[PDB]
UniProtKB/Swiss-Prot annotation:
This is Mitogen-activated protein kinase kinase kinase 20. Ubiquitously expressed. Isoform ZAKbeta is the predominant form in all tissues examined, except for liver, in which isoform ZAKalpha is more highly expressed. It is linked to Split-foot malformation with mesoaxial polydactyly: An autosomal recessive disorder characterized by a split-foot defect, mesoaxial polydactyly, nail abnormalities of the hands, and sensorineural hearing loss. The gene is MAP3K20. The modification Phosphoserine is found at S158, S268. The modification Phosphothreonine is found at T154. Belongs to the protein kinase superfamily. STE Ser/Thr protein kinase family. MAP kinase kinase kinase subfamily. The active site is at D126 (proton acceptor). Homodimer. Interacts with ZNF33A. Component of a signaling complex containing at least AKAP13, PKN1, MAPK14, MAP3K20 and MAP2K3. Within this complex, AKAP13 interacts directly with PKN1, which in turn recruits MAPK14, MAP2K3 and MAP3K20. Interacts with EIF2AK4/GCN2; promoting EIF2AK4/GCN2 kinase activity. Changing R243W: In CNM6; uncertain significance. ATP binds at C15, G16, G17, G18, S19, F20, G21, S22, V23, K38.
């Protein structure tokens, strides 16, 4: 639970501006290290139980700032930015099947560590593409895994914005198991495949209602390979007990990566977005219209 003095940080982005939970690029002066700094209202000593977690697919803890009123947590800075920004940029056109498999495996692995391998079991509860970042070598790192337990206050702002990623039982404050993260993972995989914002332009409460009451799920284009479509359907089951664990997902991904037919089918799908984008847009028009 290393303490980093506020005076040992050179901020690139003014740390005054954002709400609690905002993250700033900074330099850790005495270490000559680029870092991320998440601004917090306060942090409890108990948070030290998570300071020992370490895995190549979760963001690496560096230290804590403990000088009132300045509180924060310091981590590694992933040089390529957030997964959400990448997906929704034209840069995502570069992605082929190998890219997607590697990144899908990255997230799955990090979530398996949190669920099963860490000294303290962690259910994320807020997994989404905005909470994944891309390190300089392309390794994906999961962020905010301790938010739900140690700084839940940071999760309030655009809770509505997050509804597309939230399992029905989380939206309803029903009993929650580790598989709530499998549901969210399914949405992240859908984003990588379609490179679209889930339920784009839809009111969050409307999303939440459709997901919970009508069993609505994100549109899977008909030309999406069946192995991927099936994985998404498993992640998205209403009955949380029937969703796969991350151990099971990893095994599914390994099976898919041995399928010699898949790369051509998937790459043809990925590069065909001009063809199937209308399928997603049609569902959105329909849901918006039916709301009217
Ligand atoms: C364009 O944006 C970007 N580009 N490159 C980037 N690299 C990194 C980041 C980036 C870092 N964090 C970031 C952060 F600073 C502080 C904490 C967290 N998580 S935590 O659960 O609170 C947490 C983590 C580790 C140990 C914990 C121990 C107890 C409690 C909570 C703990 C976090 F996730 N968030 N985002 C954005 C970007």
């Amino acid at each position: 639970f290393v303490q980093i003095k506020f005076d040992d940080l050179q901020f690139f982005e003014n740390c005054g501006g954002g709400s609690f939970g905002s993250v700033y690029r900074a330099k850790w002066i005495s270490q000559d290290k680029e870092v991320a700094v998440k601004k917090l209202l306060k942090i409890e000593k108990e948070a030290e139980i998570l300071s020992v977690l370490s895995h190549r697919n979760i963001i690496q803890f560096y230290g804590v700032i403990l000088e009132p009123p300045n509180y924060g947590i310091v981590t590694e800075y992933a040089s390529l930015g957030s997964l959400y920004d990448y997906i929704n940029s034209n840069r995502s056109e570069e992605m082929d099947m190998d890219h997607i498999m590697t990144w899908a495996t990255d997230v799955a692995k990090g979530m398996h560590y949190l669920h099963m391998e860490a000294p303290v079991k962690v259910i994320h509860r807020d997994l989404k593409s905005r909470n994944v970042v891309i390190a300089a070598d392309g390794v994906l790192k999961i962020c905010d895994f301790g938010a739900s337990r140690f700084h839940n206050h940071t999760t309030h702002m655009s809770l509505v914005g997050t509804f597309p990623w939230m399992a029905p039982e989380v939206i309803q404050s029903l009993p929650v198991s580790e598989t709530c993260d499998t549901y969210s993972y399914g949405v992240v995989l859908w984003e990588m495949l379609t490179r679209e914002v889930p339920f784009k332009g839809l009111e969050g409460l409307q999303v939440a209602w459709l997901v919970v009451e009508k069993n609505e799920r994100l549109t899977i284009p008909s030309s999406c390979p069946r192995s991927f479509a099936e994985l998404l359907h498993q992640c998205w089951e209403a009955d949380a007990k029937k969703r796969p664990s991350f151990k099971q997902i990893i095994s599914i991904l390994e099976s898919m990566s041995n399928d010699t037919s898949l790369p051509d089918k998937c790459n043809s799908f990925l590069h065909n977005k001009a063809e199937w984008r209308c399928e997603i847009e049609a569902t959105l028009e329909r849901l918006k219209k039916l709301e009217r």
